[PDB]
């Protein structure tokens, strides 16, 4: 109960919709023998389903008027009420991987311009070079903020313009 | 015409922030607003176009006429 | 709160603040006639007289919505 | 010289004379994080102070832990010793951490400026006569003066030994604390309790018999 | 076969190997971790 | 100069060492233009002088027992009959507000838009201490230092009242009644966690 | 000089042998700059003089039987009616604290920020002993030595009261009543193990 909401372990339309889905799976399950793999598959679907509802209520996800897990994307309402795993943890779990791919792709382009013809090595990726920058870019925020302090991250007004 | 009031040619040009925040400030805009019509038309369509939405955003929520927000197609 | 004192004294106040205090800070087909010593013609008086009346009508109105809650 | 892998090419930013003049230089940088020289100099200051806080920390975990399992103390486990000693105390933890960050923050922000400019706090008129002894040494991370009461610094030989002994006991203690956290999540017992469990049965009681080296 | 490894190191071939890597990694994780809507522990 | 505010830091070149209250404290480079700095040296003193008068009036009410600084304008609402030294003054809000608008702008317009001076030589020095010969920059330094303390302390009154709702001496007695339980962390405002 | 404090040790070059109370005892090199040392020679004497006045007031209370030094500010809390020689003084805490803030800063500001001298020649020598001719550095040495003893002894009062909770003479009588069972080891504070 943060913004008119309720815990999904406490709401009833959530549990009503769980019983709605398991009803649809079981009336689909009835057409098969109890040994048959079209019934082994559906009972494995249920145990993935029933554990999914158990795990969403375990994490304390917020339901509402429709009985669905609602997310809270604000720190200070997720840090305070124990919901940083909804948005506030994957907003840095993403931005680690995002700037990682950016930094590896940056370092591959920076370390290819001092060559004979760098356009050839954007077709033919230097795999012993590219994987070497791939592994060693794992501390990229530790390397970027040191490059941020110099002035070597931002190229100056050598950049190309039209008519300022 | 009466000696009191503000001149537009001294409010734009004199609002230049120090330490080069906004270049030379608003210096010299007045002869490029007064002489240019497309600048005057572009400001007017920017202002009227936002206070046309402001008409629309404030008449479904705050219906100003009687038995509106009961006539639904209106 | 009084009908005739407050609106008279407020205009008397604001025809003195531009007359004795804000004289030089305001100064930074011939109707401007400086016959008071630093140009206090009817154009300047009706500017400080519009401020003198309007704040005086604001005081008498705030004194009469049953009272103050400030 | 004495690399962490004897067959590896040591990266070239650990073989410069401003990097081979450094304690704990075993050629170990498989991410290249200290290729920039001031970034090496900044991370060298991060390693000295992550390790000295860990050596003080680990000696605040096992030394009152070994001297509890042997009797003559009643200090509880380190993951529960924050819960106790606040009732044998006077402030809330909020009222105690804020005075902590004031006291620690005055120190750390002076070490910050001495890293930025060595001999910052040795300028006259900073302190009340005490600022004279705060120029550090010719190399940073090793202040001396009032931080060396016993006077071990003034040798110039046996000195790289005390450097490299500090770092190696320091790096071992950082792995010890990364130990202590991990051997509290995985089994919930004490670190000396995990040492007692491994000594009474080495060949069955380890991290191969819990759910964290899971296949 | 050095020329054959250049072909394996072109742009679309590394793209179709790395995308089978990255999808095939996320497919195996989403098998052994069924339906991660929220970061649990 | 006489100070460095963070020892080891370089000094900003646009702060002259002759100026009273100087430490080289401008991390924003907020006074790099000389006209902006000249307006700021005027405005720091006047903020400092009015706060020294402000923080003394906030203390001397509680030192003399007349409620606190927050409750002294609680007669214009929820009653009337304003006091000063216990003595009644029969003014409502809407009259003295007009009195302090005309008379204060009459003193502002003589001060502000009649120059830019902040240490006026003459009638504002009755006894005579700073004749601008030698003892000027020393006493100007003390007017800044006691003034900067007052501006902090008034900001330490508003934030203290926004947090706890108690006055200066009314909670200084509480910090002395409980040194570890009556500080800025026991309320769930200044430290949220 | 007149002493070595650890025989066989070299002397620090930044401690002049002319100075009263010198032994060459600065293992931290804590006074290597001359302005820092000059402030310290001012501050050691004043710490020494106030502690000699401090340790005498802590003893003469128990020598005259008025509780101890720790319990003399136990009237501002838990009661009132402060005593001195048994005589009442009708001052509460909040008045004399304001008296000793104004009057003491009035004596500090005449002392501290009006120079840097620590042996003022003139009105602070009523009878006249050190006229700075020959007997000066001898008696300045004794003012240091009795002063350094007092600063140790006051630190030996706070740590003794933090450990045992008893006063100076109240436990000196106990060390004389039990020489081997009333020392700093029988309490489980100064030695934690045995
Ligand atoms: C558009 C931006 C925005 C808006 C409208 C809000 C809105 C709100 N925040 Mg918030 N917040 C934001 C960005 C924002 N936040 C960001 C970027 C941070 C930093 C990570 C925070 C940190 C934060 C904290 C720490 C707290 C809030 C609180 C609040 C509430 C007051 C309100 C719902 C507070 C709250 O819960 O209510 C008092 C609270 O404690 N927020
Ligand atoms: C956070 C503590 C910390 C920090 C700041 C450093 C920093 C450093 N170490 Mg060190 N080290 C540490 C812990 C640390 N180490 C531990 C615990 C060990 C024992 C395994 C070692 C063993 C070690 C060796 C053997 C050598 C170094 C070296 C270095 C230097 C260059 C490597 C580099 O760029 O690292 C910078 C790294 C960081 C700033 C932080 C990285 C944190 C990562 C991302 C987390 C990793 C978690 C882990 C996988 C579990 C640099 C000064 C080399 C050196 O001194 O030569 C000059 C060297 O030869 N270290
Ligand atoms: C509004 C009051 C005010 C004003 C106008 C100034 C003005 C000045 N101060 Mg000053 N100062 C103040 C309050 C103020 N101070 C307080 C309260 C303190 C104690 C914390 C200090 C401590 C201080 C030091 C230690 C030094 C100065 C210095 C200076 C000068 C250059 C720095 C500058 O450009 O500041 C311009 C400042 C402003 C325009 C105020 C901006 C406020 C922003 C917009 C919001 C701040 C929010 C606040 C922090 C929290 C709410 C300038 C004359 C330097 C100097 O040479 O002294 C003369 C110097 O060394 N000041
Ligand atoms: C009416 C009135 C008018 C016309 C002004 C006008 C001015 N004030 Mg001012 N002032 C007023 C009321 C007024 N004030 C009152 C009632 C207070 C006390 C609450 C102040 C406190 C005050 C301060 C503290 C400062 C000014 C400053 C200034 C100047 C910018 C300008 C001349 C500033 C100044 O001198 O110029 C920067 C300045 O620092 N005034
Ligand atoms: C706070 C009191 C104080 C102060 C300021 C000094 C100051 C001085 N002493 Mg001194 N001393 C003191 C107490 C003090 N002493 C006591 C109590 C003893 C007896 C144990 C001595 C015994 C002593 C000897 C034997 C000698 C000196 C000497 C000196 C001079 C140079 C050493 C130095 O830089 O010390 C500066 C000291 C400080 C700034 C104090 C730092 C305290 C730290 C921060 C914490 C200490 C904690 C404490 C040990 C336990 C709690 C200097 C004038 C030498 C000298 O030439 O005499 C003039 C010398 O030979 N002292
Ligand atoms: C309230 C009025 C007042 C004022 C204005 C001063 C002003 C002064 N005193 Mg002073 N003094 C006062 C009251 C006052 N005192 C009283 C009431 C006593 C007797 C209890 C003393 C006893 C005294 C001594 C013994 C000395 C001074 C000194 C000084 C001068 C140094 C200024 C300085 O360094 O500031 C610093 C400002 C402070 C408030 C000092 C900070 C508090 C200290 C560090 C005491 C804490 C001790 C504690 C055990 C250490 C912390 C624990 C640590 C080991 C971890 C200065 C002129 C020193 C001097 O001559 O030079 C000196 O040696 N005074
Ligand atoms: C600071 C620290 C711990 C300090 C702990 C303290 C003070 C504990 C205090 C307490 O317990 C007590 C005393 C008492 C308890 O009641 C209370 C608490 C408060 C709980 C550990 C550091 C721990 C630091 C650790 C573990 C760092 C490990 C880093 C490694 C291994 C990185 C290696 C690399 O980065 C390099 C070197 C180079 C790259 O190229 C390659 C890779 C491999 C990436
Ligand atoms: C805090 C303050 C200004 C703070 C500004 C600071 C620190 C700025 C610092 C910096 O800019 C520099 C230096 C350099 C930049 O590069 C960086 C920053 C960091 C940005 C001004 C307060 C200024 C505060 C003032 C002037 C307060 C005046 C209060 C008065 C007159 C009170 C009157 C009353 O209290 C009585 C007397 C009786 C009550 O009953 C009734 C009332 C009316 C409430
Ligand atoms: C111990 C002390 C200082 C000790 C410092 C030492 C040893 C430093 C040694 C070093 O620096 C050197 C030399 C050289 C460096 O290289 C190495 C080290 C080792 C760092 C000062 C105490 C100084 C102690 C002082 C000044 C005590 C003053 C006490 C007073 C006035 C008491 C008053 C009362 O007791 C009465 C009178 C009546 C009671 O009822 C009420 C009260 C109020 C409690
Ligand atoms: C191209 C160009 C142009 C054009 C431009 C345009 C088109 C613009 C537009 C613009 C716009 C379109 C803008 C907008 C703006 C807006 C704003 C800026 C807003 C603000 C808001 C506010 C301020 C609010 C406030 C508030 C709130 C918060 C709520 C309640 C009330 C209040 C009031 C309080 C021209 C012509 C010039 C020419 C040149 C170039
Ligand atoms: C003769 C003379 C004199 C006198 C003078 C005077 C006294 C003047 C005055 C004047 C005046 C006395 C003026 C006035 C003015 C005013 C005005 C000009 C007004 C305006 C108004 C308005 C604008 C209003 C509006 C409104 C209304 C309608 C109502 C309600 C509110 C409002 C606001 C809406 C003397 C003796 C000194 C000297 C000699 C000469
Ligand atoms: C270095 C910076 C990082 C430091 C991180 C510090 C994290 C530890 C903060 C305190 C632990 C979590 O806090 C949580 O347990 C504390 C210990 O019981 C509680 O604190 C309180 O708990 C009990 C009452 O309920 C009392 O017995 C405790 O004396 C009291 O301190 C807090 O009400 C609770 O919010």
Q: What is the CA radius of gyration of chain C?
A: 15
Start-to-end CA span in chain F (Å): 41
> Is F102 in contact with C17 (Cβ distance < 8 A)?
yes
SS3 category, F2 = coil
| Alpha helices (H) along D117-142 | none
Q: Which residues pair with A6 in a beta bridge?
A: A63
Give the residue, by CA position, lying nearest to ligand 12 atom 30: D92
CA distances from C40 to B55, C15, C43, C52 (A): 45, 10, 8, 15
| Nearest of D168, D114, D105 to residue D145 by alpha carbon | D114
CA distances from A65 to A49, D178, G112 (A): 22, 45, 74
In this complex, is the C-beta atom of D36 within 8 Å of any C-beta atom belonging to chain A?
Answer: yes
**Which chains sit next to C, with 3 or more Cβ pairs under 8 A?**
B, F
Reading the block at residue D132, the tokens are: 């004279």
Is residue G87 within a helix (H) or strand (E), and if so which, with residue range? strand G87-88
In this complex, is the C-beta atom of A51 within 8 Å of any C-beta atom belonging to chain E?
Answer: yes
CA distances from A123 to A105, D80, D196 (A): 14, 58, 59
For the CA of A77, the nearest atom of ligand 1? 36
The answer to whether the CB of G28 is under 6 A from ligand 9 is yes
Residue D118 has a CB neighbour count (10 Å cut-off) of: 17
Is residue F83 within a helix (H) or strand (E), and if so which, with residue range? strand F83-84
Reading the block at residue G131, the tokens are: 């006229």
CA distances from F11 to A111, F21, F154 (A): 39, 14, 29
CA dihedral G171→G174→G178→G182, nearest 10 degrees, is -30
CA D98 to chain centre: 23
**Which chains sit next to G, with 3 or more Cβ pairs under 8 A?**
D
Rounded-to-integer distance, Cα E37 and Cα A71, Å: 10
Is residue F162 within a helix (H) or strand (E), and if so which, with residue range? helix F136-163
Are A63 and A11 within 8 A, CB to CB? yes
B16 backbone dihedrals φ, ψ, rounded to 5°: -105, 115
Rounded-to-integer distance, Cα G143 and Cα A140, Å: 64
Rounded-to-integer distance, Cα G191 and Cα F103, Å: 74
Rounded-to-integer distance, Cα F44 and Cα F181, Å: 35
Q: Which residues pair with G84 in a beta bridge?
A: G87
Q: SS3 sequence, chain B? A: CCCCCCCHHHCCCCCCCCCCCCCCCCCCCHHHHHCCHHHHHHHHHHHHHHHHHHHHHHHHCCCCCCCECCECCC
Neighboring chain A residues of E35 at a CB cutoff of 8 Å: 48, 52, 55
Query: Within 13 Å of residue F35, how many CA atoms lie on the same side as its CB?
Result: 3
| Alpha helices (H) along chain E | 2-8, 11-32
Q: Which residues contact G71 (CB under 8 A, 6 or more apart)?
A: none
Rounded-to-integer distance, Cα G42 and Cα G50, Å: 13
Are A64 and A5 within 8 A, CB to CB? yes
Rounded-to-integer distance, Cα F67 and Cα E31, Å: 69
CA distances from D140 to D134, D137, D157, E3, F23 (A): 11, 6, 18, 53, 27
What is the nearest CA distance from F33 to chain B, expressed in angstroms?
Answer: 7
What is the nearest CA distance from D147 to chain F, expressed in angstroms?
Answer: 19
> Burial of G58 by CB count in 10 Å (0-12 exposed, 13-18 middle, 19+ buried)?
buried
Are A21 and A49 within 8 A, CB to CB? yes
Neighboring chain B residues of F36 at a CB cutoff of 8 Å: 18-19
DSSP-derived letter for residue C12 is H
CA D59 to chain centre: 11
Ligand nearest to the CA of G23: 5
Rounded-to-integer distance, Cα G33 and Cα D121, Å: 14
Rounded-to-integer distance, Cα F185 and Cα G12, Å: 48
Are D24 and D167 within 8 A, CB to CB? yes
For the CA of F192, the nearest atom of ligand 1? 40
| Nearest of D10, D64, D18 to residue D39 by alpha carbon | D18
- What sign does the CA torsion over A80, A83, A86, A89 have? positive
Reading the block at residue A99, the tokens are: 């700037």
CA distances from F70 to A146, D199, F157, G168 (A): 49, 68, 9, 50
Are A59 and E9 within 8 A, CB to CB? no
| Nearest of A51, A61, A45 to residue A5 by alpha carbon | A61
Rounded-to-integer distance, Cα D122 and Cα G35, Å: 13
For the CA of D175, the nearest atom of ligand 2? 17
What is the nearest CA distance from F181 to chain D, expressed in angstroms?
Answer: 6
Reading the block at residue F47, the tokens are: 């903020």
Q: Which residues contact A107 (CB under 8 A, 6 or more apart)?
A: A133, A137
| Nearest of A163, A113, A111, A161 to residue A136 by alpha carbon | A111
Q: Indicate the pairing of strand A62-63 with strand A6-7.
A: antiparallel
A103-112, long-range: CB < 8 A, 24+ apart = A103/A137, A103/A140, A103/A143, A103/A144, A104/A130, A104/A133, A104/A134, A104/A137, A104/A140, A107/A133, A107/A137, A108/A133
Are A8 and A57 within 8 A, CB to CB? yes
Reading the block at residue E26, the tokens are: 């996320």
Are G167 and G68 within 8 A, CB to CB? yes
Reading the block at residue F61, the tokens are: 């009410």
Reading the block at residue D149, the tokens are: 């009461």
| Nearest of B37, B34, B25 to residue B7 by alpha carbon | B34
**Which chains sit next to D, with 3 or more Cβ pairs under 8 A?**
A, F, G
Start-to-end CA span in chain D (Å): 37
Reading the block at residue A56, the tokens are: 């969403």
Rounded-to-integer distance, Cα D98 and Cα F185, Å: 7
Rounded-to-integer distance, Cα D192 and Cα D175, Å: 16
> Burial of C19 by CB count in 10 Å (0-12 exposed, 13-18 middle, 19+ buried)?
middle
Query: Within 13 Å of residue G100, how many CA atoms lie on the same side as its CB?
Result: 7
Start-to-end CA span in chain E (Å): 48
In this complex, is the C-beta atom of E4 within 8 Å of any C-beta atom belonging to chain A?
Answer: no
For residue F133, the CA-to-ligand 4 centroid distance in Å is 30
What is the nearest CA distance from F119 to chain C, expressed in angstroms?
Answer: 21
Q: Where are the domains of chain A?
A: 1-164
Reading the block at residue F166, the tokens are: 């108690």
SS3 category, C57 = helix
Rounded-to-integer distance, Cα D95 and Cα F181, Å: 7
For residue B50, the CA-to-ligand 10 centroid distance in Å is 8
- Burial annotation F57-86 (CB, 10 A radius, 16+ → b, else e): ebbebbeeeeebbeeeeebbeeeeebeeee
Place of tokens 């480079």: F29
| Nearest of G68, G86, G72 to residue G170 by alpha carbon | G68
For residue D47, the CA-to-ligand 2 centroid distance in Å is 7
Place of tokens 């305001």: C26
> Is B19 in contact with F29 (Cβ distance < 8 A)?
yes
Q: What is the CA radius of gyration of chain D?
A: 21
Task: Give me the helix-helix angle, D37-58 and D159-185, nearest 10°.
Answer: 60
Are G22 and G141 within 8 A, CB to CB? no
DSSP string, A75-89: TTTSTTTT-TTTTTT
Is residue A7 within a helix (H) or strand (E), and if so which, with residue range? strand A6-7
Number of residues assigned to chain G? 194
> Burial of D56 by CB count in 10 Å (0-12 exposed, 13-18 middle, 19+ buried)?
exposed
Residue F147 has a CB neighbour count (10 Å cut-off) of: 21
**In a mutagenesis test of the C interface, which of F97, F102, F107 is the best target, namely the one with the most C β-carbons within 10 Å?**
F102
Q: SS3 sequence, A24-77? A: HHHHHHCCCCCCCHHHHHHHHHHHHHHHHHHHHHHCCCEECCCCCCECCCCCCC
Rounded-to-integer distance, Cα F50 and Cα F147, Å: 9
Are G184 and G172 within 8 A, CB to CB? no
Rounded-to-integer distance, Cα D133 and Cα D126, Å: 11
Q: Which residues contact A99 (CB under 8 A, 6 or more apart)?
A: A140, A141, A144
Nearest chain C Cα to B6, which residue? C28
Rounded-to-integer distance, Cα B32 and Cα G92, Å: 77
| Nearest of G54, G58, G14, G46 to residue G166 by alpha carbon | G58
- Choose the closest CB to A136 out of D30, D36, D39: D30
Task: Give me the helix-helix angle, D191-200 and D159-185, nearest 10°.
Answer: 80
Give the angle F34-F40-F44 at the CA atoms, nearest 5°. Answer: 150
> Is D129 in contact with G36 (Cβ distance < 8 A)?
yes
CATH class of segment(s) A1-164: mainly alpha
| Nearest of C61, C55, C68 to residue C13 by alpha carbon | C55
| Alpha helices (H) along A111-161 | 120-123, 127-136, 140-150
Reading the block at residue A58, the tokens are: 């375990």
* Biggest distance spanned by C-alpha atoms of chain G: 58
Reading the block at residue G157, the tokens are: 């009062």
Rounded-to-integer distance, Cα C65 and Cα G88, Å: 63
Are F112 and F39 within 8 A, CB to CB? no
Number of H helices, E strands in chain F: 4, 2
Is residue F88 within a helix (H) or strand (E), and if so which, with residue range? strand F87-88
Rounded-to-integer distance, Cα D140 and Cα D44, Å: 9
Rounded-to-integer distance, Cα A51 and Cα A14, Å: 14
> Burial of G153 by CB count in 10 Å (0-12 exposed, 13-18 middle, 19+ buried)?
middle
For the CA of F113, the nearest atom of ligand 4? 32
Q: Which residues contact F47 (CB under 8 A, 6 or more apart)?
A: F147, F151
Pocket residues: Cβ below 6 A from ligand 12: D 83, 86-87, 92-93
**Method used experimentally:** cryo-EM
Rounded-to-integer distance, Cα G124 and Cα G114, Å: 16
Is residue G88 within a helix (H) or strand (E), and if so which, with residue range? strand G87-88
> Is B2 in contact with C44 (Cβ distance < 8 A)?
no
Q: Which residues pair with A7 in a beta bridge?
A: A62
Chains A and G: 3 or more CB pairs within 8 Å of each other: no
Last residue before each gap in chain C (C to N over 2.5 A):
28
Is residue G136 within a helix (H) or strand (E), and if so which, with residue range? helix G136-163
| Nearest of F101, F78, F82, F102 to residue F90 by alpha carbon | F82
Q: Which residues pair with F83 in a beta bridge?
A: F88
Number of domains, chain C: 1
> Is D30 in contact with A135 (Cβ distance < 8 A)?
yes
Place of tokens 């190997």: E17
Reading the block at residue D134, the tokens are: 């705060």
- For the structural domain made of E1-41, what CATH number should be given? 1.20.5.510
DSSP-derived letter for residue D204 is T
In this complex, is the C-beta atom of C47 within 8 Å of any C-beta atom belonging to chain B?
Answer: yes
Nearest chain E Cα to A68, which residue? E37
Rounded-to-integer distance, Cα G163 and Cα G175, Å: 14
């Amino acid at each position: 109960d943060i913004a008119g909401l309720t815990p999904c372990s406490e709401s009833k339309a959530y549990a009503k919709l769980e019983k709605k889905e398991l009803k649809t799976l079981e009336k689909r399950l009835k057409q098969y023998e109890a040994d048959s793999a079209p019934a082994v598959a559906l009972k494995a679907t249920m145990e993935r389903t029933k554990a999914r509802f158990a795990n969403y209520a375990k994490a304390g996800l917020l339901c509402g008027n429709d009985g669905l897990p609602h997310l809270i994307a604000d720190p200070g309402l997720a840090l305070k009420y124990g919901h940083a795993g909804e948005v506030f943890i994957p907003t840095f779990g993403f931005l680690y991987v995002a700037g990682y791919i950016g930094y590896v792709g940056r370092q591959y382009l920076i370390a290819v311009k001092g060559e004979a013809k760098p356009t050839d090595k954007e077709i033919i990726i230097d795999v012993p070079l590219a994987t070497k920058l791939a592994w060693q870019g794992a501390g990229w925020p530790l390397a970027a903020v040191q490059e941020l302090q110099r002035g070597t991250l931002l190229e100056k007004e050598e950049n190309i313009t039209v008519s300022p | 015409n009466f000696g009191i009031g503000h001149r537009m040619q001294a409010i734009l040009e004199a609002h230049t922030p120090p330490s080069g925040s906004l270049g030379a400030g608003h210096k010299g805009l007045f002869d490029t607003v007064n002489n240019s019509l497309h600048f005057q038309l572009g400001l007017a369509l920017a202002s009227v176009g936002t206070i046309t939405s402001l008409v629309a955003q404030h008449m479904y929520s705050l219906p100003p006429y009687a038995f509106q927000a009961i006539d639904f197609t209106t | 709160l009084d009908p005739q004192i407050v609106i008279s004294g407020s205009t008397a106040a604001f025809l003195a603040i531009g007359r004795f205090v804000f004289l030089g800070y305001q100064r930074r087909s011939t109707i401007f006639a400086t016959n008071d010593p630093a140009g206090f013609n009817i154009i300047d008086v009706a500017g400080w007289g519009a401020l003198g009346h309007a704040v005086g009508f604001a005081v008498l109105a705030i004194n009469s919505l049953q009272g103050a809650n400030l | 010289r004495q690399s962490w892998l004897p067959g590896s090419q040591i990266p070239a930013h650990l073989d410069t004379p401003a990097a081979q003049a450094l304690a704990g230089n075993f050629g170990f940088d498989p991410l290249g994080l200290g290729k920039d020289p001031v970034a090496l100099r900044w991370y060298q200051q991060a390693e000295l102070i992550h390790c000295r806080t860990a050596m003080a920390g680990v000696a605040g975990i096992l030394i009152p832990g070994l001297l509890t399992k042997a009797g003559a103390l009643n200090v509880p486990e380190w993951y529960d010793a924050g819960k106790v000693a606040i009732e044998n105390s006077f402030a809330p933890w909020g009222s105690l951490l804020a005075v902590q960050l004031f006291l620690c923050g005055f120190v750390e922000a002076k070490r910050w400026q001495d890293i930025r400019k060595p001999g910052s706090q040795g300028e006259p008129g900073s302190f009340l006569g005490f600022e004279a002894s705060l120029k550090g040494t010719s190399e940073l991370g090793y202040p001396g003066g009032p931080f060396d009461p016993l006077g071990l610094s003034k040798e110039a030989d046996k000195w790289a030994d005390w450097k490299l002994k500090e770092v190696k006991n320091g790096r071992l203690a950082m792995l010890a604390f990364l130990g202590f956290v991990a051997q509290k999540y995985a089994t919930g017992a004490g670190p000396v309790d995990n040492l007692a469990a491994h000594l009474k049965d080495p060949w069955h009681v380890n991290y191969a018999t819990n759910g964290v080296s899971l296949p | 076969m050095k020329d054959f490894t250049t072909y394996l190191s072109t742009a679309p071939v590394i793209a179709t190997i790395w995308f089978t890597f990255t999808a095939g990694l996320l497919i195996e994780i989403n098998r052994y971790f069924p339906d991660p809507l929220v970061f649990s522990f | 100069k006489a100070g460095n505010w963070l020892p080891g830091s370089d000094a900003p070149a646009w702060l002259p060492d002759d100026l009273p209250g100087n430490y080289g404290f401008d991390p924003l480079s907020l006074g790099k233009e000389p006209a902006s700095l000249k307006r700021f040296t005027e405005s720091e003193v006047i903020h400092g002088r009015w706060a020294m008068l402000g923080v003394a009036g906030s203390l001397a009410v509680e030192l003399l027992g007349y409620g606190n600084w927050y409750d002294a304008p609680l007669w214009a609402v929820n009653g009337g009959k304003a006091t000063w030294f216990g003595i009644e003054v029969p003014f409502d809000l809407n009259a003295l507000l007009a009195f302090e608008f005309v008379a204060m702008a009459a003193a502002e317009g003589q001060r502000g838009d009649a120059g830019g001076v902040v240490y006026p030589g003459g009638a504002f020095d009755p006894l005579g201490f700073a004749k601008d010969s030698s003892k000027s920059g020393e006493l100007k330094l003390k007017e800044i230092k006691n003034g900067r303390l007052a501006m902090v302390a008034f900001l330490g009154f508003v934030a203290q009242h926004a947090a706890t709702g108690k006055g200066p001496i009314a909670a200084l007695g509480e910090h002395l009644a409980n040194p570890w339980g009556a500080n800025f962390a026991t309320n769930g405002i200044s430290v949220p966690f």
